[PDB]
Amino acid sequence: CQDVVQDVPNVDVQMLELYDRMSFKDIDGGVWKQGWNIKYDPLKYNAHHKLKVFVVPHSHNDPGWIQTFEEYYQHDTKHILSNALRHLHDNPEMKFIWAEISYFARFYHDLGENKKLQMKSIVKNGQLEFVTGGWVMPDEANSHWRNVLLQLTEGQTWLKQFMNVTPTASWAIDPFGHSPTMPYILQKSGFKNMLIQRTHYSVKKELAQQRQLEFLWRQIWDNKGDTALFTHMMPFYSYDIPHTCGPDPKVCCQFDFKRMGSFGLSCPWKVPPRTISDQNVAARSDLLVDQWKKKAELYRTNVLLIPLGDDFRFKQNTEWDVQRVNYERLFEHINSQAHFNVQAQFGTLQEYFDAVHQAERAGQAEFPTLSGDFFTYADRSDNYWSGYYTSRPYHKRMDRVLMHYVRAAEMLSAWHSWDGMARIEERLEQARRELSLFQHHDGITGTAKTHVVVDYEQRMQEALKACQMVMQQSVYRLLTKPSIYSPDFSFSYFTLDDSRWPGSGVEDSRTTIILGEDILPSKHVVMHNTLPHWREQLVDFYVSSPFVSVTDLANNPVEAQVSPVWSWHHDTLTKTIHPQGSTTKYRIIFKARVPPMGLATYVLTISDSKPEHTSYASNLLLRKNPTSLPLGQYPEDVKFGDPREISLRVGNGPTLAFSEQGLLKSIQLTQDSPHVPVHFKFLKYGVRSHGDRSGAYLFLPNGPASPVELGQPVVLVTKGKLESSVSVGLPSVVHQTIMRGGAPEIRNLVDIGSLDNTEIVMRLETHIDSGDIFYTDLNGLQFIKRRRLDKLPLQANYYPIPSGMFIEDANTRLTLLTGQPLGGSSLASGELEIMQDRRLASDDERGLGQGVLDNKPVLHIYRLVLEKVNNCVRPSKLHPAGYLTSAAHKASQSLLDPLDKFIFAENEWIGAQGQFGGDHPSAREDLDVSVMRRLTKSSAKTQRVGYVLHRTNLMQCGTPEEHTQKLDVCHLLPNVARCERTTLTFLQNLEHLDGMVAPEVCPMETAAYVSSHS
Ligand SMILES: *[C@@H]1O[C@H](CO)[C@@H](O)[C@H](O)[C@H]1NC(C)=O
Ligand SMILES: N[C@H]1S[C@H](CO)[C@@H](O)[C@H](O)[C@@H]1O
């Protein structure tokens, strides 16, 4: 195993170092506005050294953006694919690349058999080539690596099954900024090459000057380079035709033959394309070849890539003809005129890369190595695309919830083979596809029109219901005596109970367990733990009486706490935000202990009076002018008082102090330690009154944030033996700090209501001497070092916070983990901040054609971990990565993959069992079974189950952390007959494993294994 902490990789380009050195001046470079006037030596190419030019036709098809997926499919994409089939079939030399498999699969299944055969033929023969092959071209900022893998696998599995092809070249021309998580997953999925486009215009200029636009992109901690993937970065402002033939768009636009008038398109530069004829072909070729040779100067080989396409292009037959015929005339002339020393032709993406590597092997070029990322993107001036790190936060949070439900549903149902009548595969396929579709760069990014966001939400809602059905049928089968088990596959044996989605104050969706002497004395509940290690976690349920006690299935009492059910109301009469308590529903909370990848059953029983093992929380409402708050049978009366500072401590955990406005002000780790200043504050950013306006994509603040005026907010303090909390009704946010004995959990119910042109930010102020350094994660996979640059505007210093961020000095670190991707930064030493929601009245000129005014209440969740790190073995000052501690990693897992809770629906569960998985190996804490998926239907004689294993890297800080078992996924199911290591998509076998044992992986590595069972 490579050491990912102590050896700083030596690479030719390290992006953080490059950023420290670059000046980012935005000067007018001439026709290439963000570059310079390229010059070339006409004698560079000659008869023995020609410039090979590959013109690659393409069509960017967004799976939803300004129309829904189905609307685009009906209006445009089905015509594009139908005409691509006809045109490629009839013109053997024409080529075309396709990226979005969600659309291709939709099209293909609707084709008649004769056309399906013609389509397979033009793919088999190389005319139509799939690039990447994912369900979509995903966002790379907000997406979790697990979902990037899910969608890649969804599209590639379909391609292998129906087209018999697996792409090894990736095409990502539109995500807004690029992440090294992509080459990481692709290189472990059989890929050999990738292409990217949206990178800061200053980065394009810098790399073009050094001919470093093609590089071997390795991970920031990779000393040896085994994770390296050849990458091609396009050089210009857009992938459209005007910005892909060369540096001068006024000239390139003349070679987009769809722009002469009849198609309703024209050239902004005021010079239109002209049909190629024998009389103008030499002058036209003169111009085009000169653009090509200038573009070729930016690269190292004599093989040149010229994409030819734009959004939803190649729709009409007439368009296919106008582009193909004109380009064929240009190729015939150019290739026959020796003085140009060029051989041009239509080609595919793979053809381009194969030729580039042939040149490389002939010793024609050596490529630089590079590590780092390409955030935050700016396409021009100060227009940094950091707004979409937060836009439509409700769906960004929904993404993480569905991410977990898909994993749990696939894992719970993988243990058994299911009759087709159970519709398990059917429901899982729908769930994977709707979550995969949302990974699109206009989905999770929050950059689609309102009705499209609604479509993605509805799709995700159906996917969550599909996951619930599969999960509850699985639980019933796993915990019922086999000879008693009698399933109705349409019946709901259990209802899922999720205390954080949609969340209290977002949707009253949770069911109350109704108990009563005259109706039902007890209820079974079951918890699932998808993580491969024993786990304890407090769980809560709503119940109809405060007199309830908990037992496990051996009837051992389990300590529990009952608290009221508090709901906050923006009182339109008193103009205050205050909580109301239920007089008929209560919350029962207790510690569940669940086996690795297992289940544990408990029973809640009512009694006529206070149970021996259940305690009741006290409640204190702080506000002037209080009114009574009755709580039905709840045994402790609510107490009142004027606002005042508060201090709380649960168990032996930290002691937290709060201001009289209910916000954290300090954390004391142990009884004797200092009360470390850690203050939460809410602020607001506005929009510029002159100049460019912020919108769904762009964050263009009118200066640093201003504090939100708090007034005299109502603060609710609930103190219990197992859980305490301080909640406060702030304008636009009910902020809650929850304590259960470790790092607190923070929940924000964010309702920006009608506050136009406002972005609400949550900031932490500490005295940690972090200076200009902070860390944020990339796709929940790795933490990368960031350096605040005052030479760049505020919005350029915002980065994606897909799952966590932290600041530290020599002794202290503060880490904020998230349950949803949002944008954030550290704008001053000792600070961390993360945007909660943004409501923007204006469109930001990127094509969406609307502002963001469809905000809805969202419950954002976090864990806040303050720790001493002076004893931790950290990377050196020059290392570009950072790593979490064990506590911070477990806190992240508590947010993204909590225990799942199931409530038995009927009155009696006959044949119920108390536990499942007690014999599953409890793996080391840094190892996770990211995916467990049965790959075969029940009719397969040989069953196959796939596993994706990921080991993160946690800092060594002096904790002995011992006793754990080796996890061999190939022996999790009985009767194993074969164990193979495969690509991460499970599509290719890489290694036949000895003894059918799957070796665990190294820190920061991810491997996939498939076990076969007889
Ligand atoms: C599928 O994969 C390769 C294509 O080159 C070939 O060996 C095989 O015969 C192809 N035919 C199938 C399985 O449809
Ligand atoms: N070409 C881009 S423009 C818009 C960005 O400006 C993007 O969000 C869409 O996904 C399109 O496909």
Ligand SMILES: [Zn+2]
């Ligand atoms: Zn797009």
